Design a protein around this ligand. Structure first.
Ligand code: SF4
Lengths: 148, 148, 232, 109, 98, 109, 109, 109
């Protein structure tokens, strides 16, 4: 299923990987300051770790209930940045449509979601559980300052 | 097969000791493979090498630091740095006092305060061959060499 | 013995010498970006440093852990450029589009620099006396609002450099489009979405059999159209 | 209360050290920027002298805030109402009067 | 360094005793490299099988052949840095079991 | 503003401490270089004495720079315009006069 | 220029601290050796006083050395010609007087 | 030479502070031992005043020994021949006489 499991600290819940409303907001005025002025540290997924093709595993009833792999490629991405292959096992999946869908989801995730940020924040931390959607404003990334 | 085999065996039996001897700003003069001679004063106790104080071209004579005592039999050599910044070596004939040594011919433009070393004819020369040069971002270079 | 000149060799071994100056050059022409010239200093007049008539801008840039090794390069060198004003973020939309970019680092004593950098002038100025090294970017390690550090590596090692070069693909061509091995020279047929197109600027090969067929060139396909969708 | 009213001794130190974005590697070219907005905030090393009676009132006022809870104050430097906070307030007790050496740091919040 | 390589080639083309009483060229190839290996590892196996070591000059790539070479640099007490402890050169020996 | 117009009354202390890349070899011998392209820049300990009602103008001028934005200054040492920066400028208030103890760090640009 | 031609105060320090290569584990026996050929290389903490006009001449002279560039000197301590280098030369300017505090470190080079 | 013949006119300072290995157990109790065979060696903070002409002879003697090869001495605190070493002998020149701040460390050999 497309979600992540979030232990609230009290209860277990599931947040889907959707465009969600209620997005929190942060800027230089909101997050801590180190001795060096680095409010946000950005790191990027390695070029070589953005697979653009997968061999996805599932059990095929029609073939005889044994492991069959469906292969999912992103043509335009392979046509420009070489061609990386990875292997997945869709969990309960049993019909090739399900496998192909999971395969395509993994590819698009690796290809698009590239950059992470560590921006240790103040006392407001306790309102945030994993899967919360935030927005980041950086003055040295946007030209002039537009938040406070 | 036999030749490649014998080569690996003889290297592992004869080359045993590596030396790490971080040097100064002459460290952009070297690249791996370069052959060096480590004239350690620990292995001598007489310190037969140092820097040149003055060079007299006509009536070729070198004014050194320390003392030089010519071997009673055989002819010793003196190893200098040439005008082209290269390791040339020449002979020694007679010594006035214990500093003013007389050479066969003075190499062209032998810079004063350049490295000089006396090698006796009957003595193991003790060669190494460089493997790595590291920069320490203090204008010093850490050198590793293996027995030659 | 390093590829150096007689004057640099004489200078190396002097008791008192001139400044060691390092002049960087980041080229991204091969990766879709621009060429940049940097130095960590400004001349006696507080102007960009001139070398062989080239003006290396004053900018905070430095590198750590350069070495020559004759059995590998374990622990890649690390070059850092100040991200203040965000010109490093402005270099490219995505920071990993800058990977494969070339770095030429020039180490040269200050006595050999151009006569234009000194209020008095230089009698030893010689554009020949410098040490050069070439490195590939491998990864924008990290980027903050203060600094951005790349990992470097000699073109011999890098990461994309593997022998026997050519991976065998099914339904994916590896010749460069309109290149020597592709050997297609006809007018514009289609884009990378296979959509028919008589526009020369928007004609690019999908490198798949469908695209190859559009160009009408299926003889010289750089793939092996039968071999096995899967691997192992 | 929310305001500081007791007069201060001639002994009053003011250090400025505004926040800057300093970037340099080694002894080379250096890039400097104004960091945030409220660049300079200034620390006032102030000293007060009061009789033994209302020394208790002054201590209770400083203790009320107790590091946090910035209060309104008008220093004898700029004569402009600012929010400041007290860090330590080291106190000396003598035979007839008492002394207070305090650190005042102004906060935008 | 095509020049260095040319020397190396001339060397490994030398005639040497075969081992069954004939002569033979010193080194020759006859590989069939049938996997993706890292470029440097491959280059090192070439330059190991023929006695040399690969030197990334920084500018170019050459081969320094493992031979008695002239042009020997010299290092003594007065030349290498002297740390606080009076140890200019540190030696370290391969293990007997190696 | 681009220039400094006040005068140092009692004189100032200048500290040079240049950068040298220095390597100590064996038998006394060594290696030096000026390290940076322009090593010695020097710092000045500038001390000023100002009226209490006027000190505002000098404070406003020093703060508008805020560490960065180096200004031209003519020291009573060499009598040449040099661009210098101000980082701390500690101030000391009394009942009549205010004393400025500031650090002026010369920059090539 | 390769020499120093200025008048010194009556009060300068000359630290010796010769280089000694000594081995000792815990607090047991210790062996000691002379280490370098040039064992003691001395360090002079020289104080100079100069009129405000000639301060420029002396300041410029020390600047073209800037740590490196050893110059000959004849200290009154022994009246011998020895090669030395200057490190810091912190200077104080008064109304009519200028004071130099320098650490000359003699070198073989 | 072997013997120090110059007289200390004002005295020196003698600190013993010997090397002792010691283990702190639980309820106050402990355990102590003299660590080495020869723990205390009694550092002497020697001060000499010598006319300027005679300063160079003492320099030649001290610098010739140079942080190794101990010399015999009879300190005016116990009046016995002990072998001692000096490492520092910082000097302090004046118009007429020169001071020596030296550290003397007694050695068992
Ligand atoms: S697929 Fe065909 S037209 Fe496209 S690049 Fe390859 S050979 Fe050329």
């Amino acid at each position: 299923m497309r979600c992540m499991p979030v232990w609230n600290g009290q209860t277990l819940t599931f947040v889907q990987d959707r465009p969600s409303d209620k997005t929190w907001t942060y800027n230089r005025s909101n997050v801590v300051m180190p001795d060096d002025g680095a409010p946000f540290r950005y790191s990027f997924s390695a070029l070589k770790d953005r697979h653009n093709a997968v061999e996805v595993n599932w059990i095929d009833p029609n073939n005889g209930w044994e492991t069959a792999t469906e292969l999912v490629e992103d043509t335009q991405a392979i046509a420009r940045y070489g061609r990386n292959v990875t292997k997945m096992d869709a969990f309960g999946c049993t019909s090739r449509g399900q496998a192909h869908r999971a395969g395509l989801w993994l590819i698009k995730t690796e290809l698009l979601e590239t950059q992470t940020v560590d921006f240790s924040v103040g006392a407001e931390g306790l309102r945030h559980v994993p899967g919360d959607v935030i927005e980041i404003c950086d003055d040295d990334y946007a030209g002039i300052s537009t938040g406070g | 097969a036999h030749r490649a085999g014998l080569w690996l065996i003889k290297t592992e039996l004869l080359e045993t000791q590596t030396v790490d001897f971080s040097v100064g700003a002459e460290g952009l003069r070297h690249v791996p493979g370069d052959v060096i001679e480590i004239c350690d004063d620990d292995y001598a106790g007489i310190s037969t090498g140092g820097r040149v104080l003055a060079v007299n071209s006509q009536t070729r004579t070198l004014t050194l630091d320390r003392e030089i005592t010519l071997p009673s039999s055989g002819t010793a050599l003196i190893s200098l740095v040439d005008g082209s910044g290269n390791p040339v070596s020449v002979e020694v004939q007679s010594v006035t006092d214990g500093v003013k040594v007389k050479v066969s011919r003075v190499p062209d433009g032998v810079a004063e305060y350049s490295v000089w070393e006396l090698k006796l004819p009957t003595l193991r020369q003790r060669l190494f061959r460089c493997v790595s040069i590291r920069e320490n971002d203090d204008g010093t270079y850490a050198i590793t060499a293996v027995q030659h | 013995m390093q590829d150096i000149r007689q004057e640099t060799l004489n200078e190396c071994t002097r008791a008192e010498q001139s400044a060691s100056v390092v002049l960087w050059e980041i080229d991204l022409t091969e990766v879709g970006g621009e060429r940049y010239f940097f130095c960590n200093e400004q001349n006696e007049k507080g102007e960009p440093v001139t070398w062989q008539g080239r003006q290396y801008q004053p900018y905070p840039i430095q590198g750590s852990g350069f070495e020559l090794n004759g059995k590998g390069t374990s622990t890649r060198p690390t070059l850092t450029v100040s991200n203040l004003y965000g010109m490093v973020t402005g270099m490219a939309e995505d920071m990993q589009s800058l990977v494969g970019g070339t770095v030429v680092r020039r180490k040269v004593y200050a006595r050999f620099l151009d006569a234009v950098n000194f209020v008095n002038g230089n009698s030893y100025a010689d554009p020949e006396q410098e040490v050069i090294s070439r490195w590939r970017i491998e990864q924008c390690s990290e980027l903050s609002a203060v600094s951005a550090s790349f990992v470097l590596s000699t073109p011999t090692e890098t990461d994309g450099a593997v022998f026997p070069g050519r991976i065998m693909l099914a339904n994916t061509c590896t010749w460069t489009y309109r290149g020597d091995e592709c050997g297609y020279s006809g007018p514009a047929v289609a884009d990378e979405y296979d959509q028919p197109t008589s526009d020369i600027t928007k004609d690019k090969c999908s490198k798949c059999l469908s695209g190859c067929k559009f160009r009408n060139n299926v003889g010289n396909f750089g793939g092996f159209l039968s071999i096995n969708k899967l691997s192992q | 209360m929310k305001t500081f009213r007791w007069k201060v001794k001639p002994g009053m130190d003011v250090a400025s050290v505004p926040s800057v974005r300093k970037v340099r590697f080694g002894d080379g070219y250096s890039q400097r920027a104004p960091a945030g907005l409220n660049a300079n905030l200034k620390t006032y090393s102030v000293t007060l002298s009061v009789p033994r009676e209302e020394a208790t009132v002054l201590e209770s006022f400083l203790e009320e805030h107790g590091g946090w809870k910035s209060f309104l104050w008008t220093p004898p430097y700029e004569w402009r109402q600012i929010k400041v906070t007290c860090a330590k307030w080291s106190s000396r007790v003598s035979m007839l009067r008492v002394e207070f050496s305090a650190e005042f740091e102004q906060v935008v919040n | 360094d095509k020049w260095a390589l040319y020397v190396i080639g001339q060397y490994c083309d030398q005639s040497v005793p075969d081992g069954f009483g004939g002569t033979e060229p010193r080194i020759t190839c006859n590989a069939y490299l049938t996997t993706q290996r890292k470029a440097w590892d491959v280059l090192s196996d070439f330059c190991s099988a023929m006695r040399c070591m690969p030197v990334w000059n920084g500018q170019t790539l050459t081969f320094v052949q493992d031979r008695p070479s002239d042009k020997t640099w010299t290092y003594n007490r007065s030349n290498v840095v002297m740390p606080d402890d009076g140890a200019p050169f540190r030696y370290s020996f391969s293990a007997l079991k190696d």
